[PDB]
């Protein structure tokens, strides 16, 4: 899986 | 501001 | 600002 | 198998 942000 | 995770 | 995975 | 992003 991959994820992120802000 | 404050944030993060993963 | 964050990101991750694999 | 491949994955990525951000
Ligand atoms: O979630 C992984 C990714 F990101 F697609 F490569 C997996 F390989 F496990 F599918
Ligand atoms: O965003 C800051 C926080 F996180 F609320 F402390 C500020 F105080 F500057 F609003
Ligand atoms: O992305 C960060 C967060 F999470 F919003 F605090 C930044 F401080 F950089 F805005
Ligand atoms: O996921 C691989 C791919 F990319 F299809 F070749 C596997 F060899 F494992 F199928």
How far apart CA D4 and CA B2 sit, in angstroms, is: 25
The gap from C-alpha D1 to its chain's centroid, in whole angstroms, comes to 9
How far apart CA B5 and CA D2 sit, in angstroms, is: 23
- Chain D residue numbers with beta carbons less than 8 Å from the beta carbon of C3 are 6
Resolution (A): 1.3
Show Cβ contacts of residue C2 under 8 Å, excluding neighbours closer than 6 positions.
Answer: A4, A5, A6, B3, B4, B5, B6
What are the beta bridge partners of residue C3? A4
The approach used to solve this structure was: X-ray
* Complete DSSP assignment for C1-6: -EEEE-
List, chain by chain if needed, residues with CB within 6 Å of any ligand 2 atom.
B 1-2
CB A2 within 8 A of CB D5: yes
CB B3 within 8 A of CB A6: yes
CB C6 within 8 A of CB D1: no
At A5 the three-state DSSP class reads strand
How far apart CA D6 and CA C4 sit, in angstroms, is: 8
């Amino acid at each position: 899986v991959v994820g992120g942000x802000x």
